[PDB]
Ligand binder design. Structure first.
Ligand code: FAD
Length: 150
């Protein structure tokens, strides 16, 4: 995947404000900021790659920035971090993965609990919320994910 990163970075604060200010929230997130675990994925690049990960996300998962940037978040679904698209996961609920997938395809807010694994192989339940984000053009371009170790 040779995902390309936005020069000058991402407007994470602007998107967090946009999220808290959204008119018809389908899921209540409550106040959020950059201190929590989050990632921003580019819906317009091949396989919706992570283009930004907050430090709390890297800390929670045990992975470094170099290891998560440019990858579809699904790698967390395997203790070895090897998860091929369309593959039947052996540790994660298929309906769950399908739910995330359709929500993402439809720019629909979604919230799920998904089994994930940290870099050292430690299993945990990830309480995940994905909210589509509009960039400067006004159209949905990114998705912001909020991860919470349950
Ligand atoms: C911003 C953002 C943050 C994210 N953060 C995380 C995170 O922290 N942790 C995490 O684990 N994921 C996270 N994800 C999710 C991950 O990136 C994928 O989006 C998710 O795994 C679903 O998409 P996929 O491409 O993996 O689907 P696929 O690889 O296509 O897998 C879908 C699975 O569902 C099953 N399935 C499909 N259709 C049906 C059907 N009709 N009936 C029954 N079963 C069916 C299949 O058998 C398949 O194994 C995040 C996504 C975004 C956009």
């Amino acid at each position: 995947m040779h995902t390309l990163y936005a020069p000058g970075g991402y407007d994470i604060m602007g998107y967090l404000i946009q999220i808290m200010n959204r008119p018809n929230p389908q899921v209540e997130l409550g106040p959020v900021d950059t201190s929590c675990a989050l990632v921003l994925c580019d819906l317009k690049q091949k396989d919706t790659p992570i283009v930004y990960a907050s430090e709390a996300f890297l800390y929670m998962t045990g992975y470094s920035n170099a290891e998560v940037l440019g990858r579809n978040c699904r790698f967390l679904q395997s203790p070895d971090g090897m998860v091929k698209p369309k593959s039947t996961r052996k540790y994660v609920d298929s309906n769950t993965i399908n739910t995330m997938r359709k929500a993402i395809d439809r720019n629909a807010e979604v919230q799920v609990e998904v089994v994930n694994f940290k870099k050292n192989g430690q299993r945990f339940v990830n309480f995940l919320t994905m909210i589509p984000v509009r960039d400067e053009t006004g159209e949905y371009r990114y998705s912001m994910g909020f991860q919470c170790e349950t």
